Design a protein around this ligand. Structure first.
Ligand SMILES: Nc1ncnc2c(CN3C[C@H](CSc4ccc(Cl)cc4)[C@@H](O)C3)c[nH]c12
Ligand SMILES: Nc1ncnc2c(CN3C[C@H](CSc4ccc(Cl)cc4)[C@@H](O)C3)c[nH]c12
Ligand SMILES: Nc1ncnc2c(CN3C[C@H](CSc4ccc(Cl)cc4)[C@@H](O)C3)c[nH]c12
Lengths: 273, 273, 273
């Protein structure tokens, strides 16, 4: 059995995706998740939805409790986490509305706990050094890429996400520098969400949707809250269809080996006294 | 009516610039500002001076309460904030003693709140994502650039400031890397001062004065506290004259549109529940 | 008289290096050091050993009390600090098992106090801006380099260490970017250990041992805890021999000038009210 946690991002966190919905507030050792978990199904597949920023978008990226969110989904029995994330495009060919199935990140966050193993929690004892060479589940990403193609969606098969602390958007000097580093898209939430998922032995994949060109390009609409909201109003249906079509595919394929390998990588990264 | 807050930096924070001086200690929801506000005038113009590091230079860059400083100046009724900042030069042609009217930044700070909207304050409710494509007021910068020319001062019409956490100065590897990124000057205070000013709807501009060549160049005096202090002893009069000459120019030009546009950009960056 | 603090890193923190061992737990104004200081001698030389991560490796890099560690060694009367550090290699020619006598760093840490002078401690009053152009003692490094040659060890005479926050290892995008920056090796502990040593007026040098190629190369064993542990099991004897041979050399050379210059650089970096 698979069970899929879905973490909804900005404008991309609609509960109406699940049938047979039940709201469940939970607690974890790291505190409360962003909001109630929503338990439901897509076709025959058990899913668990969680709004990254709360259902009213009340929590800014720096204050999102990534530890509690991931812990809650794990405790619920999730084998996979597929998230949505809005993002700025750092590449001419990645147009607003395009989906990017990201495969790498560059961390520019500064204020966030990136591990469960902080020496303060009984549930996560020891020192943990998780490998990050392959941060995203390649098997899940494959299915997302193939599905987006079946849907006729404009979609990119890879991309490096730079995650900034926020909540401010980047300056132009920063935007230009991220391009020189080889970042393709920019957001405020991928790190440490992807890190904690890996420590939890969970298959994690991200659906990034471009909403703007940040501030590097010429003759584009400037990034702003209104601009991001506008692009998502117009294009959010794409991410919904992709999830709805991808999820039944995940449920019909075999994961025992992939998950065994993840659980091992996670277990062997922890040193006990 | 305009009112100009002036935040004095290292060696560049002299109260004697204002006539008709009155000392006023204030409180804000984010805590106490660095020091007493000093209320005064330059020609007919209402100004408010604040020493970034305290009048005895007792507060290091990491511990400066940028939120309280900006909030205090806003509450006082400031329409503009013009600051001074000492800095290292990352460019051969920017010589110690030169003024740089910076137009961009690269953030390398790690420990600083960069927003009023942290979900803990009643006075600043919601989630705020301020755009940072144009961090400094171009109209104020124009007047500074034209004025420095009228004064015959060595001055650069643009520049990218990298702001490091400090309080240590950079290593040589870091100094060299900042050059590859396209940083022109280096300090410890521009971020998040410039960010918070933007969230407050205030026209912010910075007078940067080069005091050293950091540690990248050859055959220059090494950066140290003594070296920075020495260059400022010799050149601080320039920043004083530039302020004294610029400020009456700001007071005689029309700002209603510029300020309306800033207030809008600020208001539309905030999402309420 | 010299006295040498030795901070042992991962797999490189063996007390058996000292003769005449006495265990001494201490307190400092910044809290407790990682573990008991171990007082002892190498030939005629007074040494003080401290396990960076605790003797059971229980403390992850982010939580190591670098302030307490350096303060404790200073209070004990150490003139020099020579440390060991495991690291990933960012350079083809730096092979697992090679020693790198690092001479520069690039800071990518985010959560660590980098100064004793935080305005909260009576023992360290004022604002301190330590110069970091030459972070490591060149005289100590010379002796390490010459000694490693006498031992026939594969050793590199310089290198730039990028220190990441951890505890996760880097992504591939990050690993590749650190190469473009000119980093040669990667770890999680050099900063701010090297910074605090400089503020304390102590000669600091680092013995870095490559344990892996991080994740940038092709056809190498992936970095993981097991992989790092394996390389250290095989090569730790090298770092031990190098320390044991270097230390008597330090004790027989003259340091009064070097140490006077360090003490001055440290004293003149502090501004009092
Ligand atoms: N240029 C850019 N830079 C960094 N991040 C983003 C993002 C990603 N997030 C969107 C969001 C800011 S826009 C927005 C819109 C509607 C509402 Cl209800 C709430 C917020 C932040 O979490 C970052 C999109 N474009 C970006
Ligand atoms: N190479 C460089 N790197 C980073 N920042 C600076 C700065 C800017 N600030 C000066 C100041 C250090 S020097 C100084 C001198 C007198 C007194 Cl009373 C107090 C401090 C820090 O706030 C950074 C100048 N050169 C710099
Ligand atoms: N590729 C790499 N990246 C960053 N740091 C390292 C380091 C340096 N440290 C090793 C250590 C992780 S591996 C390990 C092995 C045995 C035990 Cl008991 C405990 C931990 C961290 O402190 C970073 C080696 N390779 C690295």
């Amino acid at each position: 059995a698979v069970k899929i946690g879905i973490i909804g991002g900005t404008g991309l966190d609609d509960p109406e995706i699940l049938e047979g919905r039940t709201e469940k507030y939970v607690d974890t050792p790291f505190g409360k998740p962003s909001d109630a978990l929503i338990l439901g199904k897509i076709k025959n597949v058990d899913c668990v939805l969680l709004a990254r920023h709360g259902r009213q978008h009340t929590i800014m990226p720096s204050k999102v409790n990534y530890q509690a969110n991931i812990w809650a989904l794990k405790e619920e029995g999730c084998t996979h986490v597929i998230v949505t994330t809005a993002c700025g495009s750092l590449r001419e060919e990645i147009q607003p509305g395009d989906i990017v199935i990201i495969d790498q990140f560059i961390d520019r966050t500064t204020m966030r706990p990136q591990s469960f193993y902080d020496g303060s929690h009984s549930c996560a004892r020891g020192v943990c050094h998780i490998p990050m060479a392959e941060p995203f589940c390649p098997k899940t990403r494959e299915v997302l890429i193939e599905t987006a193609k079946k849907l006729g969606l404009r979609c990119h098969s890879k991309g490096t996400m730079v995650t900034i602390e926020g909540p401010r958007f980047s300056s132009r000097a920063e935007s230009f520098m991220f391009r020189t580093w080889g970042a393709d898209v920019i957001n405020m939430t991928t790190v440490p969400e992807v890190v904690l998922a890996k420590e939890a032995g969970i298959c994690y994949a991200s659906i990034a949707m471009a909403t703007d060109y940040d501030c590097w390009k010429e003759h584009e609409e400037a990034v702003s809250v209104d601009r991001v909201l506008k692009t998502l109003k117009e294009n959010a249906n794409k991410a919904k269809s992709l999830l709805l079509t991808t999820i039944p595919q995940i449920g019909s394929t075999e994961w025992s080996e992939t998950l065994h390998n993840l659980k091992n990588m996670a277990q062997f990264s922890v040193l006990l006294p």
